[PDB]
Amino acid sequence: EMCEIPEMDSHLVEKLGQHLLPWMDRLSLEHLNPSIYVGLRLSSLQAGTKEDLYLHSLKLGYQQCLLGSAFSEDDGDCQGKPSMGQLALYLLALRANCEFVRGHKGDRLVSQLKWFLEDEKRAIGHDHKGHPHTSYYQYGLGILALCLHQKRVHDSVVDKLLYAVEPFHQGHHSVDTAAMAGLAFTCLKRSNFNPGRRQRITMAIRTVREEILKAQTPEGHFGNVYSTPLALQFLMTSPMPGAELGTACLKARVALLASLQDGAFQNALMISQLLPVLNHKTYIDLIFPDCLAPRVMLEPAAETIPQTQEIISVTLQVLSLLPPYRQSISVLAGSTVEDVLKKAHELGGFTYETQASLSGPYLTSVMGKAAGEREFWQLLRDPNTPLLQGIADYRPKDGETIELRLVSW
């Protein structure tokens, strides 16, 4: 149809699936990723028996931790617990296996996620002035999740998502939050969930595609390379032709195909967001999913690029702190930013804290300064160009400088 990408080189898709393959074995609570599972099921690729065991661990961990305690066993956080944002994605994972939340534990989880959105609605406080504690992205994903499990939220919850769509938004992220918000609305619209806002919701969806389609860079991308998959995902639901989508969507293909054969898609989460798209599938396909639709097996990557020894110098610097820190760390070539961070800690006076996430290690504290409220520890490559990847996916080159900067958004 109108916003459609033709199929790609069968082995390029297979290449991406092979990146996911080593994750199907890290069933650790701090490595289980519902987005990966959803990724596979909606792709043209299929792991194998590993899948079912992965889903089982998801069901185990996510329920064992989010439900199962009365007066608490006198501990701080004895699992860490999945975030409510993470719970939302787990719900899509269930859908990926053609399942609805079953039993009391189902009722409990649904109830929990409805509460999260309710707190995030208080956090905003009416239709002006105030941010969610998480982000409008998880807010949109919360609404979408429950909508896929045939659970409705009150109009006052949808209201806040409706409002964020109009203005707001600066810097690449906008395009993802728009796409997510956009998808949520599609869902609601396709089942008439908030009738009192039916006409209102349709307008918003129309608002979203303008915002997104407007943000198409001359390369062909939507916002950036990593905002493109989720953008396309949303745009593959909009049924209004003319011409607009046709060429713009087909342009994105070129921009994507280029980046793809460049190795831009290293991150497991990002592969799992593109794979459905690559298979003409969206998260909206999780309303009526096809569990019998066949997918080709994935052989183990088996061979692993051995690379080559070449010791390189990378300058790590932290301004935005007490005495500014800067030290030329020496690592093996192909090392990740996290390796540079790691060597610095053991080398001298440097520390850092991370958190796990569906996206990988998230940098939270540097040199003993934990990021506050609407601030975060930005990653940058000198001069002043923010990184498109995290500490665990960016592999700096010789003589490069990395800045860890505490900005506020």
Please give the residue whose beta carbon sits closest to ligand B12 in the complex.
390
Select 2 or 84, whichever has its Cβ closest to ligand B12: 84
Pairwise CA distance, residues 126 & 51, whole Å: 43
Pairwise CA distance, residues 93 & 169, whole Å: 29
Pairwise CA distance, residues 283 & 281, whole Å: 7
**Is residue 134 close enough to count as binding ligand B12 by CB under 6 A?**
yes
Helix (H, G, I), strand (E, B) or coil at 375: strand
How far, CA to CA in Å, does 195 sit from each of 143, 158, 202? 15, 11, 11
81-100 footprint of ligand B12 as x/- string (CB under 6 A):
--x-xx--x-----------
Q: Find the shortest distance in angstroms from Cβ 241 to ligand B12.
A: 27
192-231 footprint of ligand B12 as x/- string (CB under 6 A):
--------------------------------x-xx--x-
Select 190 or 374, whichever has its Cβ closest to ligand B12: 374
Select 153 or 269, whichever has its Cβ closest to ligand B12: 269
259-278 footprint of ligand B12 as x/- string (CB under 6 A):
--------x--x--------
**Is residue 29 close enough to count as binding ligand B12 by CB under 6 A?**
no
Select 31 or 200, whichever has its Cβ closest to ligand B12: 31
Angle CA 35–107–197, to nearest 5: 75
Select 108 or 131, whichever has its Cβ closest to ligand B12: 131
Q: Does 136 belong to an annotated binding site? A: yes
Select 43 or 177, whichever has its Cβ closest to ligand B12: 177
End-to-end CA distance of the chain: 38
Q: Which stretch binds ligand B12 (CB under 6 A): 104-112, 150-158, 295-303, 384-392?
A: 384-392
Pairwise CA distance, residues 187 & 147, whole Å: 6
Pairwise CA distance, residues 45 & 345, whole Å: 40
Angle CA 230–236–240, to nearest 5: 135
Q: Does 379 belong to an annotated binding site? A: yes
**Is residue 378 close enough to count as binding ligand B12 by CB under 6 A?**
yes
Select 198 or 374, whichever has its Cβ closest to ligand B12: 374
φ, ψ of residue 392 to 5 degrees: the values are -105, 5
Tell me the number of residues near ligand B12 by CB under 6 A: 37
- Side-chain half-sphere CA neighbours of 112 within 13 A: 22
Quick one: which of 249, 360, 369, 396 contacts ligand B12 (CB under 6 A)? 360
Residues 235 and 212 sit within 8 Å (Cβ to Cβ)? yes
Q: Which stretch binds ligand B12 (CB under 6 A): 22-30, 143-151, 161-169, 352-360?
A: 352-360
Give the pairing of strands 369-370 and 362-366.
antiparallel
CB contact set of 51 (below 8 Å; sequence gap of 6+): 24, 37, 40, 41
- Chain centroid offset of residue 223 CA: 15
Q: Does 377 belong to an annotated binding site? A: yes
Spell out the alpha helix ranges (H) of 104-227.
Answer: 104-124, 136-148, 155-165, 174-189, 198-214
Select 44 or 224, whichever has its Cβ closest to ligand B12: 224
Tokens of 275: 């794979």
Q: Find the shortest distance in angstroms from Cβ 405 to ligand B12.
A: 8
Q: Does 327 belong to an annotated binding site? A: no
Q: Does 134 belong to an annotated binding site? A: yes
φ, ψ of residue 220 to 5 degrees: the values are 125, -15
Near ligand B12 in 141-200, by CB under 6 A = 141, 172-173, 176-177
**Is residue 117 close enough to count as binding ligand B12 by CB under 6 A?**
no
**Is residue 365 close enough to count as binding ligand B12 by CB under 6 A?**
no
> Burial level of 214, CB count in 10 A (0-12/13-18/19+)?
exposed
Select 2 or 371, whichever has its Cβ closest to ligand B12: 371
Chain contacts with ligand B12 (rule: CB under 6 A): 83, 85-86, 89, 134-135, 137-138, 141, 172-173, 176-177, 224, 226-227, 230, 267, 270, 357-363, 376-379, 386-390, 393, 409
Q: Which residues are annotated as a binding site for cob(II)alamin?
A: 86, 134-138, 172-176, 224, 227, 273, 377-379
